[PDB]
Design a protein around this motif. Structure first.
Motif: not given
Lengths: 74, 484, 640
Positions: C48-55, C157-158, C527-531
């Protein structure tokens, strides 16, 4: 039960290891084995070879555990 | 702004997930599976199964002066009630049994012993699964297995034919399939049930001698005995499955028989018993008991799951007739075709109760002839309150929430596993084919979703998968082979 | 089966029914099966990301994934009315509500964090439930608390959108390695929540790590962060009768058991089997007493408030409310003996819930939706990253730089298409900003989208015509500054070689960026990036001479599990042809206790900067035991 030990041993190979404390339930202990005997017996069985022994154990559930030991006359 | 547009587009997708599949865990009922498991006990005459109900545990805690022990780790549980009526000459008593069963939280998971466990669907074969030299239909108690062997057979002319003989592998013996039928229906009755009465005839030796020779070459005839002869129609002879039936009949008849004994049912009952017991005098009793167990083989759940015309599912005899008549077709069916498979969730959760009940039935029926009432009470008493919960957890059927994410639609909600307690899938079996993909998977299963540690064992169900209603969570209403 | 003739494309045309996890992947037809299966694995490994955004480039199924994955949001399931609110901690509280139809009394729970397993968890946006006060109606579909994944309108958003350029940065971007801007790394931030149990028995006491002499505090408070990674340390005493060890409060020893974690504790749950009067006498229990009292105060508070509802005949209570009430009642009730692992325990067991904001660090693994993997080799200041100069897009800096070498070998072309689409979209946005009325802006937007996705264009025309002029201006400004949504469906509706070719031919002004110190022109596109879950901490081991599971029980900072030397390792070492030194290392490091003691003693007593160790030649203890037992056996070695 002393008479039934060999019959239990064939069904459950880990009986010798389990009773003493030193598979997944290896060396759990005698009291733990007593509580979980139904689970252990189902866990350790030969489908073809030891089905007859398993049925006998089902027949004699009450006689598996021994609380009283006889001593013959002096 | 942008967020409002994104929500607007998401609502207008026109490709929508099947809510019923995602939420099927909530809409599945324990009673449907519990009822047959309880009715397995009804074999005992005293025991009659009245019903079952799942009820919430609704007890307000009240201060007790006596010492009370509460575990730090908490389990959210529900109570299932199984009500049975024992009626016998001895007395009449009603036994109500209470069992603890896990309760669904937030519609997709369980909380037990302070931990979050998620139930995942299991992929299994529907029925009539192929095995080496055998075709098997799975039942709750004893699987019904047809085992095959190849043997030489000699014509009246001296012509040698190689034919397949099918024996029921049941009650720890391989017994020819037709004698089971003879023991209840009778020889003429068995022929009538199969509808082979007109085509296949039995004649005496003298009748054979007077009979026209041309018919003898036209229709195949076999020598049962010096005084007994069996004649079969040629068109009937052409079909290999019909050959299977004829070969089983030939194995049924040993040479040392009289025509009168063939038409007596009790002879066939005696033979059926003779396979199982060494003593020759108790044959009838053993045979009739075997017939009763044969009738016990088929349960209501297998009938509901089975996907053939109801005429073929009426009783064990109908099922055996259907399997033998379509033996060649059923052996040639794809193991991986999703039409021949199904997914189950709650069945294996309640399955251990069947083992406990079966142990109880064996104890009452076979251990002793002592007073039944206390013993049948012991059957229910022997089961502990947390037997189902303890077996579910310790046997590790259930899955811990190892999730690192809030995303649960595919990691847990829609996850399936081929591996199970009773699994055709095994590492030692080297089920490399089972690990692979099959064209039926498209639209039902995920092609690219699997775990590198055990590829093919676990995967993700399609969000758009539609399981046909009234098919009991079967991918297709009908199996692969039409049989019509 | 062998036959694939059954598969006919016309049957599955226009439908994504055959796709499952790949419904979150744009342009999935262009990505290889291996990369797709890696993506499916990554989504479960995503954190989970605090500042997650819709792609920015979306498949349009993402919101549905957010909807049907219920772990992230709590939705009311009926119309409710808030009866009362009860507080245990500032962070943790309970809200009692009544169904407006059934009349049933139920409760909703508020806490800062959600624990999943191990260290994994996420913080909650508790704004709505915190807003609710007594006699406030909760509507049917209101979302009481949400995860950071969901936004104001419940979009899902992931990951975060990061400007990316394929560039060879001093060979730091070697193989699958990434260099990130410090600001960009701030965006990719995770939470860690831990539930840690410290058990203190009668003879154990907790040292005054967080307290002075006048006020004894042995562990952090609800609003205080952990210091030096030590929650508390327990000293076990042979007899607690003397109480002579009062002077020992500040000091620490190796025997003391230390419990390690970092973050803000947000909840304490204490299970005590000791009578209150026995606890009260000792000052060292003072802090504990407060929280014990607080727990009781909370529990009693619910009991008094709900006793009429629960113990009344009507009993219109949910099972959750009933069990909560029963547990609190058990807590206040006497003769409550708490058992852990089916055994009654002395003293008390404390569970701390600790929430820490964990930032991106070197060795973290980040990826895109197309199966690529990357490890954060270096985090560098924004100025040091490629920055375009002398253009309309002047001073634009690349957040992440990815390896250009081998990109086509990966067989995941779609990442490039995402980059190209967001890069061309930057030009469209600047065109809208630079000139025209609102009508001109919507015209440019609609033309570009017509080039990309017709369905998006049609729906955007409807949505735009619906908007009021003020709302239209606000939406256009949002598009200009924050970004432009582009829809790339997994299989049907994505753009291809020909469509991107036409896009480039029509938009002649769009050409590569000329960066400040780079001869080669570069493309910078989001580019959409995930952790991913992996961090180096998981596999770190370090050992010095004196599994233990203390680390798993939070009693050790890091694993001290020994490395194993085998015959293969001994052979590779024997390449040196100096077997004596190999045996010396084996004896000094492991096998020989006397030589091991000599090595430790010499290391601490010798010169710090010159170390020469002389090891005595002696039989090992195992060898001595072997000789003794064998002689009793009746067999003796002859040095065969």
């Amino acid at each position: 039960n002393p008479i039934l030990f060999t019959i239990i041993k064939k069904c459950i190979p880990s009986i010798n290891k389990i009773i003493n404390y030193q598979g997944e339930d290896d060396y759990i202990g005698l009291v733990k084995f007593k509580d979980n005997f139904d689970d252990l017996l189902e866990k350790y069985t030969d489908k073809k070879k030891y089905q007859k022994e398993y049925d006998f154990l089902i027949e004699n559930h009450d006689k598996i555990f021994i609380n009283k030991l006889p001593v013959f006359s002096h | 702004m942008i967020s409002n547009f994104r929500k607007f587009h998401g609502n207008k997708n026109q490709e929508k997930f099947n809510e019923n599949l995602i939420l099927n865990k909530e809409n599945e009922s324990i009673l449907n599976y519990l009822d047959p498991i309880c009715k397995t006990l009804e074999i005992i005459p005293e025991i009659t199964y009245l019903g079952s109900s799942v009820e919430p545990i609704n007890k307000v805690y009240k201060f007790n002066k006596e010492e009370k022990t509460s575990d730090i780790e908490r389990s959210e549980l529900q109570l299932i009630k199984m009500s049975f009526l024992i009626e016998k000459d001895d007395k009449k008593e009603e036994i109500n049994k209470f069992i603890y069963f896990p309760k669904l939280i937030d519609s997709q998971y369980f909380i037990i012993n302070g931990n979050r466990y998620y139930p995942i669907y299991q992929l299994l074969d529907s029925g009539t699964y192929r095995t080496n030299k055998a075709l098997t239909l799975k039942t709750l108690l004893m699987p019904i297995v047809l085992r095959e062997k190849k043997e030489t057979f000699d014509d009246i002319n001296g012509e040698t034919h190689t034919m397949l003989n099918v024996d029921l592998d049941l009650f720890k013996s391989k017994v020819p399939f037709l004698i089971y039928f003879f023991s209840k229906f009778g020889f003429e009755g068995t022929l009538e049930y199969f509808g082979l009465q007109d085509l296949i005839h039995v004649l005496m030796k003298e009748d054979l001698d007077q009979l026209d020779e041309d018919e003898i070459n036209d229709n195949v005839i076999f020598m049962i005995t010096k005084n007994i002869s069996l004649v079969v129609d040629k068109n009937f002879f052409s079909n290999k499955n019909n050959q299977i039936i004829i070969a089983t009949l030939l194995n049924c008849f040993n040479t040392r028989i009289k025509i009168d004994k063939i038409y007596e049912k009790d002879y066939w009952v005696k033979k059926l018993g003779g396979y199982f017991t060494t003593n020759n005098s108790n044959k009838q009793e053993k045979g009739e008991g075997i017939i009763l167990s044969f009738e016990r083989i088929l349960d209501e759940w297998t009938k509901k799951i089975l996907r053939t015309e109801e005429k073929n599912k009426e009783d064990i005899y109908s099922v055996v007739r259907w399997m033998i008549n379509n033996y060649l077709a059923l052996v040639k069916q794809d193991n991986m075709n999703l039409a021949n498979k199904r997914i189950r969730l709650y069945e294996y959760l309640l399955h251990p109760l069947l083992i406990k009940f079966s142990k109880g039935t064996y104890r009452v029926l076979n251990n002793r002839n002592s007073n039944k009432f206390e013993k049948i009470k012991t059957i229910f008493s022997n089961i502990q309150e947390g037997f189902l919960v303890k077996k579910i957890i310790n046997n590790e059927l259930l899955r811990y929430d190892n999730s690192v994410n809030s995303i649960s639609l595919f990691t847990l909600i829609l996850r399936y596993t081929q591996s199970g307690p009773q699994s055709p899938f095994s590492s030692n079996s080297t089920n490399n084919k089972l690990r692979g993909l099959h064209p039926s998977y498209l639209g039902r299963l995920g092609l690219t979703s699997t775990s590198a540690g055990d590829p093919g064992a676990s995967g993700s169900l399609t969000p758009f998968l539609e399981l046909p209603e009234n098919s009991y969570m079967h991918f297709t209403e009908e199996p692969e082979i039409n049989l019509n | 089966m062998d036959d694939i003739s059954v598969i006919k494309n016309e049957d599955y045309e226009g439908s994504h029914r055959f796709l499952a996890e790949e419904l979150l992947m744009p342009n999935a037809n262009k990505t290889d099966g291996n990369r797709s299966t890696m993506f499916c694995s990554h989504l479960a490994q995503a954190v989970t990301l605090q500042k997650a955004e819709p792609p920015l480039v979306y498949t349009n199924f993402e919101n549905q994934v957010g909807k049907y994955s219920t772990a992230g949001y709590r939705k009311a399931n009926s119309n409710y009315k808030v009866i009362e609110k009860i507080y245990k901690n500032d962070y943790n509280y309970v809200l009692i509500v009544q169904d407006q139809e059934t009349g049933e009394y139920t409760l909703f729970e508020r806490a800062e964090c959600e624990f999943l397993t191990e260290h994994y968890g996420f913080q909650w946006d508790n704004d709505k439930i915190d807003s609710l006060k007594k006699d406030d109606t909760i509507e049917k579909d209101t979302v009481l608390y949400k995860n950071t994944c969901y936004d104001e309108n419940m979009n899902f958003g992931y990951g975060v959108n990061l400007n990316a350029a394929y560039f060879s940065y001093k060979n730091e971007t070697l193989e699958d390695a990434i260099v990130i801007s410090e600001s960009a790394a701030k965006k990719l931030g995770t939470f860690s929540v831990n539930k840690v149990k410290v058990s203190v028995n009668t003879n154990d006491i907790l040292l005054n790590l967080y307290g002075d002499n006048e006020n004894y505090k042995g562990f952090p408070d609800i609003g205080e962060h952990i210091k030096n990674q030590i929650i508390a340390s327990r000293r076990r005493f042979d007899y607690n009768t003397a109480l002579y060890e009062l002077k020992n409060l500040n000091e620490m020893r190796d025997s003391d058991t230390p419990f390690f974690a970092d973050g803000k504790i947000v909840d304490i749950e204490i299970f005590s089997n000791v009578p209150e009067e026995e606890l009260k006498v000792q000052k060292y229990n003072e802090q504990v007493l407060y929280y014990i009292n607080k727990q009781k105060e909370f529990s009693n508070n619910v009991y008094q408030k709900l006793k009429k509802i629960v113990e009344g005949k009507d009993n219109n209570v949910s099972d959750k409310l009933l069990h909560f009430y029963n547990n609190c009642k058990m807590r206040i009730d006497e003769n409550i003996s708490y058992t852990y692992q089916n055994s009654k325990f002395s003293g008390f067991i404390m569970e701390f819930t600790i929430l820490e904001e964990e930032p991106l660090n070197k060795g973290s693994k980040i990826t895109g939706r197309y199966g690529n993997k990357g490890v954060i080799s270096k985090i560098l200041p924004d100025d040091q990253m490629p920055t375009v100069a002398e253009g309309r897009f002047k001073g634009l800096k690349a957040d992440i730089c990815l390896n250009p070498l081998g990109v086509f070998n990966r067989l995941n072309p779609s990442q490039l298409i995402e980059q190209e689409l967001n890069w061309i979209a930057k030009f469209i946005r600047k065109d809208m900003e630079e000139a025209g009325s609102n009508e001109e802006k919507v015209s440019i937007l609609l033309d570009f989208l017509n080039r990309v996705n017709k369905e998006e264009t049609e729906l955007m025309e409807e949505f735009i015509n619906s908007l009021n002029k003020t709302e239209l201006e606000e939406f256009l400004n949002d598009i200009i500054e924050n970004g432009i949504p582009i829809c790339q469906k997994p299989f049907f509706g994505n753009i291809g070689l020909d469509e991107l070719w036409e896009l480039y031919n029509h938009y002649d002004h769009i050409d590569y960026f000329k960066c400040e110190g780079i001869s080669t022109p570069l493309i910078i596109g989001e580019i959409y990036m995930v952790r991913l879950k992996h961090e180096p901490h998981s596999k770190f081991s370090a050992r010095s001479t004196s599994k233990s599971k203390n680390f798993k029980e939070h009693k050790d900072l890091y694993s001290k599990t020994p490395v194993r030397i085998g015959n293969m390792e001994i052979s590779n070492l024997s390449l040196t042809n100096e077997m004596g030194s190999i045996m010396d290392m084996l004896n000094s490091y492991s096998n020989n206790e006397t030589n091991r003691r000599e090595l430790i003693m010499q290391l601490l007593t010798g010169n710090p900067f010159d170390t020469n160790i002389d090891l005595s030649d002696v039989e090992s203890g195992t060898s001595k035991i072997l000789k003794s037992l064998f002689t009793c056996l009746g067999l003796s070695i002859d040095d065969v």
